Design a binder for this molecule. Structure first.
Ligand SMILES: *[C@@H]1O[C@H](CO)[C@@H](O[C@@H]2O[C@H](CO)[C@@H](O)[C@H](O)[C@H]2NC(C)=O)[C@H](O)[C@H]1NC(C)=O
Ligand SMILES: *[C@@H]1O[C@H](CO)[C@@H](O)[C@H](O)[C@H]1NC(C)=O
Ligand SMILES: *[C@@H]1O[C@H](CO)[C@@H](O)[C@H](O)[C@H]1NC(C)=O
Ligand SMILES: [Mg+2]
Ligand SMILES: [Mg+2]
Ligand SMILES: [Mg+2]
Ligand SMILES: [Mg+2]
Length: 528
């Protein structure tokens, strides 16, 4: 009757025990002492039972982490743990015999010396001896970290309920090592893994043409990102197209050692008193700006943002919105670039270009809050830049915060195309600057809830201010100017603030810094 064994459940955890008692009826002595090792670690978590119960079984950090008996390979950063068995790169001061208390098996993080920093391991990185690991703390359940860079679980389907493809799958290996990853990531079967340091999160492949990749739904911990010039080329020119080397350097201004009328105003904290309305932009002030027209009828549809000589952004809901019947093929549309009069045709200033292919961010969802309201379009032929056409620089995690702190305000350049899908009207491009508003103040002014993916902007209303919410085009650029490398970076892709109607308040724009890698897979998908 081993099934019995005066079970502890009642003797040692449903109430405490603290030894002997783990004696009368209990054999295999050192196992009574490996239990005791566990039990001394769980010490301070004696009440309630479930806490202790879940401490002893150890996928769980209590206090200084000694109790951990789970299976995590990786450190805080991404470094793989050097097996405890091992001396390369590091001869251990603490081998399995010297501290036989802790379970020093394989490379799973432990804490046999109970260092204040908690569970840790030896590194495969020769410059780093021991780096602590980030482990599920007891009673703060779920919360994936590092955008699923250290994801060692088993998720095998996309957000849209599609099947992941195997990571060899004949062609899924043919295109794998086409690009470099982090090899400290175990790419099993068909599970959702984040090789390429994707700021968006984990993902996998899907049935379709080569390189099809839905993303994976996982509860990531809330990254509250809101805490000639030298800007290195992230992209691969051949696929992405040229431009990045020189992006965000306005021909008529930056290159000509010129500040426009309202840019110096951006520096200041809202000098308690001075707002500036949406006047007309002067020429070459928002060159990356784009206009999306329907072909037949000649119907202006949406704003956009040049990022190269090749790729351009917009708001997914400009081509796909089933609440209407928006489903535009490439043959339905065209874009215009470097325009200034909405109505006139700019002869030998503006370029007309057609579409080659459209790419709706795979995690686009309109059936709730327009999550990932993002799209991507390639032009059937590249575009030649000028003093009127010029691309905007794209930011990363690091620049977000850097620019959302030091820089206080941003900028919405448009022909008010968002507003005017509602009334029935600016004739010429309007520029206007808006301060980013604290997220919590933005939260309790709106019903539709805000992920970390979206943010708010505008001046504070005080009972006598009418809502200038809805400045700019829909799918157009919100932009910011770095006071360090002196380049224009796009932060937002204008979306419907509420709709726009409801407002006597603030203005909404989707984040972009997490796109970076999603883009890189798409330009490859299409090709060179
Ligand atoms: C790092 O994590 C990997 C991935 O889980 C571990 O390797 C797996 O080990 C289990 C059985 O122990 C197998 O079922 C999987 O197929 C393995 N996957 C591999 C080898 O890719 C591995 O144990 C961990 N590494 C260390 C050094 O502990
Ligand atoms: C563990 O290292 C210590 C270093 O003080 C040494 O005494 C012992 O022989 C080593 N044993 C093993 C198995 O590594
Ligand atoms: C648009 O319609 C076409 C059929 O003409 C088809 O490709 C598809 O069902 C629609 N596109 C989307 C994204 O739903
Ligand atoms: Mg019970
Ligand atoms: Mg007893
Ligand atoms: Mg007794
Ligand atoms: Mg007794």
């Amino acid at each position: 009757e081993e099934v019995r064994k005066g079970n502890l459940e009642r003797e040692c955890v449903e109430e405490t025990c603290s030894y002997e008692e783990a004696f009368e009826a209990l054999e295999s002595s050192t196992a009574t002492d490996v239990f005791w090792a566990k039990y001394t670690a769980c010490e301070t978590a004696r009440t309630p039972r479930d806490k202790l119960a879940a401490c002893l079984e150890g996928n769980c950090a209590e206090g200084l982490g000694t109790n951990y008996r789970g299976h995590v390979n990786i450190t805080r950063s991404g470094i793989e743990c050097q097996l405890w068995r091992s001396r390369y790169p590091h001869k251990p001061e603490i081998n399995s015999t010297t501290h036989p208390g802790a379970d020093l098996q394989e490379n799973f993080c432990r804490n046999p010396d109970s260092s204040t920093m908690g569970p840790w391991c030896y590194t495969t990185d020769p410059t780093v001896r021991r780096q602590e690991c980030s482990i599920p703390v007891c009673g703060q359940e779920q919360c994936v970290p590092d955008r699923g860079q250290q994801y060692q679980g088993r998720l095998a389907v996309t957000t849209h309920g599609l099947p992941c493809l195997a990571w060899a799958s004949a062609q899924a290996k043919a295109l794998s090592k086409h690009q470099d990853f982090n090899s400290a990531v175990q790419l099993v079967e068909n599970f959702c893994r984040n090789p390429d340091g994707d700021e968006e999160g984990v993902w996998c492949y899907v049935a379709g043409k080569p390189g099809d990749f839905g993303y994976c739904d996982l509860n990531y911990c809330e990254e509250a990102v809101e805490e000639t010039s030298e800007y290195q080329t992230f992209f691969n020119p051949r696929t992405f197209g040229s431009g990045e080397a020189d992006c965000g350097l306005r021909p008529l201004f930056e290159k000509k050692s010129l500040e426009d009328k309202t840019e110096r105003e951006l520096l200041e904290s809202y000098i308690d008193g001075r707002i500036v309305e949406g006047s007309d932009a002067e020429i070459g002030m928002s060159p990356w700006q784009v206009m999306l027209f329907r072909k037949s009828p000649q119907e202006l549809l949406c704003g956009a943002s040049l990022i190269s000589d090749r790729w351009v952004l917009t708001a997914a809901h400009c081509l796909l919105y089933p609440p209407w019947d928006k489903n535009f093929t490439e043959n339905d549309l065209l874009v215009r670039i470097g325009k200034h009069s909405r109505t006139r045709y700019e002869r030998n200033i503006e370029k007309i270009s057609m579409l080659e292919k459209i790419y709706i961010h795979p995690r686009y969802n309109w059936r709730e809050n327009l999550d990932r309201d993002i799209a991507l379009m390639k032009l059937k032929k590249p575009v030649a830049f000028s003093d009127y056409i010029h691309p905007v620089c794209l930011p990363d995690r690091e620049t977000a915060a850097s620019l959302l702190q030091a820089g206080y305000k941003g900028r919405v350049t448009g022909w008010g195309n968002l507003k005017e899908t509602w009334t029935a009207q600016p004739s010429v491009l309007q520029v206007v600057n808006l301060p980013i508003v604290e997220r919590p103040v933005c939260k309790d002014s709106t019903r539709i809830r805000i992920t970390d993916n979206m943010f708010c902007a505008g001046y504070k209303p005080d009972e006598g201010k009418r809502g200038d919410a809805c400045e700019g085009d829909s799918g157009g650029p919100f932009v910011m100017k770095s006071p360090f490398n002196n380049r224009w970076y796009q932060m937002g892709i204008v979306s419907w603030g509420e709709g726009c109607d409801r407002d006597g308040k603030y203005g909404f724009y989707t984040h972009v810094f997490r796109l970076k890698k999603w883009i890189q897979k798409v330009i490859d998908q299409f090709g060179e």
